[PDB]
Design a protein around this nucleic acid. Sequence first.
RNA 1: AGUAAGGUCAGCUAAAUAAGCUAUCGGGCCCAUACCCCGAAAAUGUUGGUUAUACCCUUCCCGUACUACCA
RNA 2: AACUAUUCCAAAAGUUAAACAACUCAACCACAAAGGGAUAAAACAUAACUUAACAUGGACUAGCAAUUUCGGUUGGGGUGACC
RNA 3: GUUUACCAAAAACAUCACCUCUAGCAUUACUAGUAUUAGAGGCAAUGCCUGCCCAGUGACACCAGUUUAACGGCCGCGGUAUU
RNA 4: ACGAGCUACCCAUGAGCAGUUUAAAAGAACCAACUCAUCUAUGUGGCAAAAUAGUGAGAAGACUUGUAGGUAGAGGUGAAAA
Lengths: 202, 240, 164, 77, 85
Amino acid sequence: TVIVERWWKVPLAGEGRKPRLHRRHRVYKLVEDTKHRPKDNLELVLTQSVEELGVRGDLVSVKKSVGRNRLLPQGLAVYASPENKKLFEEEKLLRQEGKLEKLQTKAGEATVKFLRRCHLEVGMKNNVKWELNPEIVARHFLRNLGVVVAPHALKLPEEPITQRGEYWCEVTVNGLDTVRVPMSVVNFERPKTKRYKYWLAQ
Amino acid sequence: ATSVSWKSRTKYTVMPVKMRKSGGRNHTGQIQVHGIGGGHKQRYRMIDFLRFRPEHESKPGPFEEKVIAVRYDPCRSADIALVAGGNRKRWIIATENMKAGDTVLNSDHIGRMAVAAREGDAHPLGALPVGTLINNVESEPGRGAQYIRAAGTCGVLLRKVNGTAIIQLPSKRQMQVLETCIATVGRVSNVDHNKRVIGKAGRNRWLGKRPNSGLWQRKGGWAGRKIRPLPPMKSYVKLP
Amino acid sequence: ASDEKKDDIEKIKSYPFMEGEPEDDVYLKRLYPRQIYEVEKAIHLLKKFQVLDFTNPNQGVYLDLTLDMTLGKKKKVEPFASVLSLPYPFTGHEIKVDEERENFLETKIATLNMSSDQIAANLQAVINEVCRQRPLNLGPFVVRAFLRSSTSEGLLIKIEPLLP
Amino acid sequence: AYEWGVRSTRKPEPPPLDRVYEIPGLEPITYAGKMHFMPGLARPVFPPWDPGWTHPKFRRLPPLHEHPLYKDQACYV
Amino acid sequence: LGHRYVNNDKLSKRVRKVWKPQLFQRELYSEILDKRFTVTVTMRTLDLIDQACGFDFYILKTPKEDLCSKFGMDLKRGMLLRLAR
RNA sequence: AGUAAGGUCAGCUAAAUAAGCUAUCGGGCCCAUACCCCGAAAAUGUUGGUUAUACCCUUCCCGUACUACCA
RNA sequence: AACUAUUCCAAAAGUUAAACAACUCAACCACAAAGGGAUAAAACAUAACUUAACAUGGACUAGCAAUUUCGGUUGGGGUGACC
RNA sequence: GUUUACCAAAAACAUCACCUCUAGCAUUACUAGUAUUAGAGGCAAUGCCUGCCCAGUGACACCAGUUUAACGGCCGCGGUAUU
RNA sequence: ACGAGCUACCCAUGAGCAGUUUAAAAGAACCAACUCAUCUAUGUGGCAAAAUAGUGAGAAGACUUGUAGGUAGAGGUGAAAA
Ligand SMILES: [K+]
Ligand SMILES: [K+]
Ligand SMILES: [K+]
Ligand SMILES: [K+]
Ligand SMILES: [K+]
Ligand SMILES: [K+]
Ligand SMILES: [Mg+2]
Ligand SMILES: [Mg+2]
Ligand SMILES: [Mg+2]
Ligand SMILES: [Mg+2]
Ligand SMILES: [Mg+2]
Ligand SMILES: [Mg+2]
Ligand SMILES: [Mg+2]
Ligand SMILES: [Mg+2]
Ligand SMILES: [Mg+2]
Ligand SMILES: [Mg+2]
Ligand SMILES: [Mg+2]
Ligand SMILES: [Mg+2]
Ligand SMILES: [Mg+2]
Ligand SMILES: [Mg+2]
Ligand SMILES: [Mg+2]
Ligand SMILES: [Mg+2]
Ligand SMILES: [Mg+2]
Ligand SMILES: [Mg+2]
Ligand SMILES: [Mg+2]
Ligand SMILES: [Mg+2]
Ligand SMILES: [Mg+2]
Ligand SMILES: [Mg+2]
Ligand SMILES: [Mg+2]
Ligand SMILES: [Mg+2]
Ligand SMILES: [Mg+2]
Ligand SMILES: [Mg+2]
Ligand SMILES: [Mg+2]
Ligand SMILES: [Mg+2]
Ligand SMILES: [Mg+2]
Ligand SMILES: [Mg+2]
Ligand SMILES: [Mg+2]
Ligand SMILES: [Mg+2]
Ligand SMILES: [Mg+2]
């Protein structure tokens, strides 16, 4: 959509009468084009949890092209009309009164997806005796997998570990979804040395 | 006023069909291509370009046909040969030394080792030997022959890599095509068409070419001997 | 001052950051920005990380400071090397400069076994020492701080209160 | 393959129907009432013509298989 | 349809200029009719659909002077009869 | 006729910081000549004006160059 | 200018995404590695690339083409000269 | 052979021949064809030949560069064998 | 807006070229029908808004010709005479 204005002034007609239009009043100039503006985003309410977007019943300002093509036609989301918002807001009250949401936050759903397919390398040094506790295991998530884990969230198999091997760790997010992630305890290596030995060579 | 093209026949037939000249006039009625018109009246022969075409879909196996006669086609510069097999006849372009009472084999079975190249047989490019002269090149499987049909023009297969054949067109430009396309081995008939000499101006009028305009145009910058590197290979293979 | 490094200073300033642990007990570092800011917690965490990643108690803390040593005027200032002895030297130290001049400096602070108060006191001295090259108030001199140990990653120190 | 038909020579396809016929539960307004063409009105769709009494010359040719002597086996004459 | 000045200077040549909207091919879904129509729509039409928070709302809220399409009026009339009946 | 335009060592060129090459003169090398090496001399067409001169302008002279068309 | 052709940007459609240069001088560890003497942050607050056929807006190049004029004095005009 | 019907029928244009240039291909021209093909031009059968020049312009490459059977070009002054 | 019933070119459909010379239906040769219009004289409000008389060139082809259709002025058409 183009927006233009006349170069030459048009004489007035104040009694609700159509003004006289001359040939020189047809000369326009383009002042602004609507397609060249930095386009905004579209806010939509999700009717079903998306893999990378929010969850069932959440507000997301997704890109305008995405909403019109894959979200709205497929029913994954609905228009964020003011009347539509309060329906989901009232719907939340029913579940959260009895703690029945079990839907996680926008990032919370992504945490479950990432932890479903992940493997943690618990690097330990054998020069000094080491005992694995939930505080230690959460450290390796931050460094290896880039995951921040609350100390109380981890539930170890309660068996003390003093040698390298394969184990399992239970991870719970917001006390709603429980994820059992594989645990791989291997000898620790310096990332500068580790990346040189394996990544640079191969 | 809008005219109607004479190409209205729908069913294939070996008998010659009536033909109306154009003279360079498009459907509107204005001249678009100059120097065309006033030629000798001609009849058109229905030419079947697709070499591999079974009579019925019940038996899709390779079939062998027999050559009846070799005639002269006024339309194209080559010579066409009548070929009959089963219960139908076809007009196909004759190779350099196709004669009457000859047997031609058409096949598509891509064999692993090889297939002996004969002067008239049509085989897919995947089974032909590396050093084979070909004509009537099929650009895409089932599309039909489009390239190399003039008199005496023959392309040479170059190599077959990762299940894909590369050929050399008469313009010395390499072309890439799937190996399952059908091609005909040999050189097109009427080899000495280039050596023909036109003895008088009237013979050009008989062919159907009108004389050039008499306006004297000074040569521009386009003229002069231009040396240009060969364009890159044209490939019809759609990489996924 | 080149515009290429000005974009870099703009980019690092635009990195999101949030205070405190989010609601989710377990979350990805990709999803949520940096959270650890306190110097006292960072020093204790490095000592804690020594226990979590069992190594020698003594570790040299090579602090990384994303110092804004540019954008004082339209013409950039040149790097130097100011030497000031720390109140608690580890067992006059030169302030090295980046080879690539990417506005980050790697200078050792103290050993891991040193108390947090002494290490924090050393940190405050370093902040004043680096700002001595360009003490003008026209432009900021410190953008981000990352305190890392020998066997640990850096933490986004809330260095803004410690600037004066 | 190379089909021997030509787009211009072949009979043109019927023009696309007007948008009114695409709206469910909406009776279109046509010019069939005035039995002559009028711009701005939708084109009527008529059922195939069904003459009550058959006429010998002007009727359509019967299908070949309608003949009593038609047989599945192909005989050559 | 109109004229324009080259280089946007008054003392320059006067030039005829025609500005055309950019057309797009999209198929839209209407809840009242439960049918998909492939309609040539513009980027402004899609913005109006989002502004009205629904395709059916856009047809049923915009008046005749704003719509300027015989297809739109027939589309409204089809849905308006659907509700009343 | 008009207009254009130039002159510099014996010769031809570049700069006006009057230079470079060649020719000319003297000497060396060789049996002698030439080549070659070394050294020296040499000029701003002409008159007047250009702070003063030169590249400029002017006068004189030689020679070069284009055009001279419609009826 | 339009129009034809070439090229770029924008619109539009789509695709992928969380990342690499130690070396142990001491010395632990049967290995493989380790610890002391650095293992950060970051990728970009989206980014990067592709996009057949049609096709919009704004520029670049070329073809074709559009609008308009071609001063005066002069012992007739041109030429030389002059204003 | 052709042309200025109504003042020029020619030495002008065309023409077989030779050469340069642009194009790897489908449903109305070219063409129901596919580089021995088809267009945009020059010059005029045959015979002997078609020399030198990419600085400028143009074209191509779209960078260095390459092209004259592309537009076009293809030198002075002085001395020297009796005259 | 209207014009390709004259003319330039083309697409359809038809129709003509006798005798003579040559293995020739060879854009060969002699000469009619036929088609162009070289030279001169009459004519110049003329028979004629381009002709008559004599004389000429081609006359089996790039030839003449009837009917009918197509291209329309920023264009059509052109073996370039603007
Ligand atoms: K032929
Ligand atoms: K006079
Ligand atoms: K003549
Ligand atoms: K050049
Ligand atoms: K007509
Ligand atoms: K008369
Ligand atoms: Mg009033
Ligand atoms: Mg032909
Ligand atoms: Mg020609
Ligand atoms: Mg010519
Ligand atoms: Mg545009
Ligand atoms: Mg005007
Ligand atoms: Mg004048
Ligand atoms: Mg005058
Ligand atoms: Mg005079
Ligand atoms: Mg003058
Ligand atoms: Mg003649
Ligand atoms: Mg005449
Ligand atoms: Mg005459
Ligand atoms: Mg030759
Ligand atoms: Mg010649
Ligand atoms: Mg000629
Ligand atoms: Mg000549
Ligand atoms: Mg030459
Ligand atoms: Mg050059
Ligand atoms: Mg006619
Ligand atoms: Mg005869
Ligand atoms: Mg003859
Ligand atoms: Mg004539
Ligand atoms: Mg007469
Ligand atoms: Mg006479
Ligand atoms: Mg007489
Ligand atoms: Mg004669
Ligand atoms: Mg003759
Ligand atoms: Mg008309
Ligand atoms: Mg014209
Ligand atoms: Mg003619
Ligand atoms: Mg002329
Ligand atoms: Mg003239």
